[PDB]
Paper text:
TAPL is a lysosomal ATP-binding cassette transporter that translocates a broad spectrum of polypeptides from the cytoplasm into the lysosomal lumen. TAPL is a homodimeric half-transporter composed of a transmembrane domain (TMD) and a cytoplasmic nucleotide-binding domain (NBD) with an N-terminal TMD (TMD0). Here we report that, in addition to its well-known role as a peptide translocator, TAPL exhibits an ATP-dependent phosphatidylserine floppase activity that is the possible cause of its high basal ATPase activity and of the lack of coupling between ATP hydrolysis and peptide efflux. Here, we present the cryo-EM structures of mouse TAPL lacking the N-terminal TMD0 in (i) phospholipid-bound, (ii) both CHS- and 9-mer peptide-bound, and (iii) ADP·BeF3-bound states at 3.2–4.0 Å resolutions.
ΔTMD0 in nanodiscs was subjected to single-particle cryo-EM analysis in the absence of peptides and nucleotides. We obtained a 3D reconstruction with no preferred orientation of the particles at an overall 3.4 Å resolution. Monomers of ΔTMD0 assemble to form homodimers in which each monomer contains a TMD with six membrane-spanning α-helices (TM 5–10) and a cytoplasmic NBD. The protein adopts the canonical inward-facing conformation in which the transport pathway opens to the cytosol and the two NBDs remain separate. However, ΔTMD0 has a cylinder-shaped transport pathway in which the highly conserved F449 residues on TM 10 penetrate into the transport pathway and face each other, forming the narrowest point (7.5 Å). Consequently, ΔTMD0 has two separate substrate binding sites, a central cavity in the cytosolic leaflet of the lysosomal membrane and an upper cavity in the luminal leaflet. The shape of the density clearly corresponds to a phospholipid molecule with two fatty acyl chains. Also, cardiolipins with four acyl chains cannot fit on the map. We, therefore, built an atomic model of the PG (16:0–18:0) molecule in the head-up direction as a phospholipid model. The bound PG mainly interacts through hydrophobic interactions between the lipid acyl chains and non-polar residues of both monomers, including L201, V227, L424, I442, I445, I446, F449, and V450. The inward-facing ΔTMD0 structure has a wide lateral gate facing the cytosolic leaflet of the lysosomal membrane, with an opening of ~18 Å in the largest diameter.
Author numbering:
A (entry chain B), B (entry chain A): 169 to 738
Amino acid sequence: TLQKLLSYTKPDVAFLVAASFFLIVAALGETFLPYYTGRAIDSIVIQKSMDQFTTAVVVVCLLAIGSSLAAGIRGGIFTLVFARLNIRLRNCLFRSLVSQETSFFDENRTGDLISRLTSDTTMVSDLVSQNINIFLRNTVKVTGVVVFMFSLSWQLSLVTFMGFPIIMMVSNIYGKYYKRLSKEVQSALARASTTAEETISAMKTVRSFANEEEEAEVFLRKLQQVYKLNRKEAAAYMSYVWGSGLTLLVVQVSILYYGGHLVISGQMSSGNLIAFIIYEFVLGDCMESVGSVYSGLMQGVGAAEKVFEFIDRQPTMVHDGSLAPDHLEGRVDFENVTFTYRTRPHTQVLQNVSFSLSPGKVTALVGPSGSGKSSCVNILENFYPLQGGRVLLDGKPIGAYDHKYLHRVISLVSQEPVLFARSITDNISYGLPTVPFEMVVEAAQKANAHGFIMELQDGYSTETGEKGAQLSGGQKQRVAMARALVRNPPVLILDEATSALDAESEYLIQQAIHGNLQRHTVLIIAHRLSTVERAHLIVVLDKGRVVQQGTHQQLLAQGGLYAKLVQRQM
Amino acid sequence: TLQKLLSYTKPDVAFLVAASFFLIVAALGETFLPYYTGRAIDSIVIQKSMDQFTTAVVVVCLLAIGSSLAAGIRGGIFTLVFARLNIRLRNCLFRSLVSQETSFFDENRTGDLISRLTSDTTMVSDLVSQNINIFLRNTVKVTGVVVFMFSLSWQLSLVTFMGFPIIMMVSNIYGKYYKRLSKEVQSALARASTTAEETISAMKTVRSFANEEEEAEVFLRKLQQVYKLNRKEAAAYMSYVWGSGLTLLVVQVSILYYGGHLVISGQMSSGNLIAFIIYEFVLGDCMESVGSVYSGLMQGVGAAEKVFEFIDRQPTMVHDGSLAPDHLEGRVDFENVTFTYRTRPHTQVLQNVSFSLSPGKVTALVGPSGSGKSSCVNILENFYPLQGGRVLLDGKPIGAYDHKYLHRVISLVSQEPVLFARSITDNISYGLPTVPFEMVVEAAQKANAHGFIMELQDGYSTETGEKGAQLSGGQKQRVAMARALVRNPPVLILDEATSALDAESEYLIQQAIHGNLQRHTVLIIAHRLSTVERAHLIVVLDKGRVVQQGTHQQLLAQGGLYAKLVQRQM
Ligand SMILES: CCCCCCCCCCCCCCCCCC(=O)O[C@@H](COC(=O)CCCCCCCCCCCCCCC)COP(=O)(O)OC[C@H](O)CO
């Protein structure tokens, strides 16, 4: 997958080569430093002079200042690459995530698709800011240090290189054993704590049995076992500290003592021995840090397969519409449509339904509250495709009209009309470009929204603050109705609350003034039967099939599947 | 606090004094080491001989071995103190988190009252062990190091003490500024992620407007602000590294050069210069470690307050009642009780109810399906207190009796009878010990619990696996029904949920043996109006006063609110 992660850095090679060059300079400065420290000490003790001027100068000016400056500049350019990579991953992932067909969002969760947008992209940008930085820096420094301490005195080099594996071996053995015993104690305490968790979380029954003493005592037993487990963990820790400490001591004193014999023999200088000891410590620390960072880098490159998982997934439907004639009537028809989801294809919610809607006239819908009525709402909004059948808007199917045009000639208001945390002069005129104020005023009046709006804390621009949860259901549905009416839509798809505790004048006036005195091929989805009393063609349905048509007077006349419900209401 | 926290270590004084002494020894050895290292280098350079061998000995054996062994023993004894303190706190906390009156369990949560237990007692023991370890160790070692590097050469100590505060001040300044800018960048990225989250989490209403593109654009610009906020953070990081590095360098080079002149002038000996530089490094490291760890210690004692608020919180309702007669009659009478909650004391959910149960005679209780009927069982089980009224039980009220004897005379069967993770021989004697297994199977046959026990995959003594889901509704109902008979209770209580998943076999076994044949003053709080199949009395009340009594044939005659329920339902 690293053939991809390169391609999302290809517009950053300028920053990358600048940062890499200054990284290499920083490492070389910090690995040429100890040799000249050794030359300084040797200039003190061997030739007692003021050659120390020139050597302290060589240390302080070029090597030290160069290391510090290059370190700062490498830090700067890597922070810049971090932010630019973060921004471009977030933008590409979103812009190709918000263009999937809705069944995508029905399958996958929402907390997961926000984890994969904040935390995962943070990890896959730290993979290039931090971990590759540290790993490459310390690799260059380790190579430099090894070559130096070979050039200085290869006897001590051979000694310490036969030495370091012994330290690593004993430390790793005892550390792994102690870690195992520590994990065992942690698991024992959690298992012993789950009993207290349950007896706390179900205190009613225990109270009913007067059995609290025999829960304190079982906790005392299930804990008093952990102590006898823990003594062994203490002993293992003690022996681990002894083992690591004494092996490190033996290697270090062997180094210093062989070095002493060399310096007295006359095969080195005091400066080169001090240089060798400092190089030994630097090599130890750098080996430690390189060994540490591999966990983080493995975790990062594992996280880099969640972003690229979604950042290019082909959508399963195309919005290939082209037509957009400005003049419609609104002949919503259905041609034996049967529809099922993509989540459970064997169950059925609509079977060969074929019912029409007369232009410019109300046409409600109702069912047994157990069959699929909402599914006709979700099919007409062109969310999901169809299995069998076809739907058409004034002759041509809805698969042919232009996308924004199609959802501008239809509308929707629903059971839970969500209002995004914005201004109410924006929530109303949501999807269409900045229509002026007076149209919004006429719209809010035409849904009894303008009533309360002027009585809020500012009027129209009262942004729906407090994380967008301040308004109540009545104003909610009325402002939603205002939102659909702004577009002047030839069709409308309306839904009604199950409690129906609102003013309720809006729906009857929609059957009377809002949609009856104008071209509005309104459809209704009614749970509360307070609107059955007036309609045009109540097409009651069940099991995904049409059973009755015509006015609900004939439903009362042919009292099948409907007259049973009106007695269930009273 | 600190005083009680000390009072919960009082049994550990032996372990504490032993570990403290060994901590002192380890710190003293590790601070005596570098002086003798400097003496070794001295003997290499100044008087080139094998007088070095004495000093390599006095470094490798005494100081190094002693330091490492003492560190091992200190680590071991602090692990033992950690586990003992953790155990004692958890035991005492759970001992006094189960003896509180149940209103205290209603008010508080249950996720908190386990997170508190586990993680907070972990923190309180971790405070003492880990951080008093680190703080006390580094205090002793820093005192020793300062005394030495004053003993060696005082001009050098005065120069490095003019040096270290300047390093600390410059690092402090620039680190504060850089952390400020990094925090602002994190906040801006989180804000833009929230504006993307409100569109991910509300996809359907967005799709309804063909408004994904403007959402992608809003996200793009809300990101392209972060880049401009981030360049300033890059410059802050640059200057932070430059400032810290250059100050540290100037201090170090001034010290090394002044030491060079000191060695040239005969004022010192090169071994003491190496000793002084090693002491400078050690002192810097330990100062940084203490400066890190004080914050963790303060956080630890800030968490250590959450335990002692519950350790000795006195219980509200004390079960000081102490009485247990041999035999009894079993006449329960709710006598003008004035019961009141403590979670919403404005309302009076039960005010002066008056009705008496009869020995062996069923007394069903149903109500208006919204009013307070579910409280009577909690009144009977002596959960909550009561202001006025006295439930007289055979000469004495319930409050006078023994706790265990009380809940051994009375039982209950909840709606969803909670059954903890045990075996189905444990549960059928929860509080009652030393039960013969044939009594268990007999009192399981009396409620038809023998059915799904033998066919379950382990025989009789099957453990309730998967955290209590290997049984179902009617199963666990028959289980709890088997519970309420193993104790031979002269009083019984029952309840049942609105689902009524059992196929009415519960009522067949109610009227079978322990409702008519055996003497059990059965009460019942039944939904769905199913208990009217048979009754020896019926109480229907509302909010404290009883409106209807007598057998249900009077309820047919006195058709108030009752005869309409059987016809409205289906
Ligand atoms: C960083 C900016 C530097 C600017 C220039 C300053 C010039 C003076 C400093 C020289 C540059 C060194 C830069 C990198 C060094 C980092 C590693 C380090 O500091 O290690 C020292 C400190 O490491 C420690 O923490 C020491 C603690 C243990 C003491 C070790 C004693 C000798 C080992 C034998 C004892 C055996 C027991 C071993 C237990 C670890 C080791 O001291 P040394 O005496 O070996 O050499 C230092 C030299 O004399 C400076 O002039």
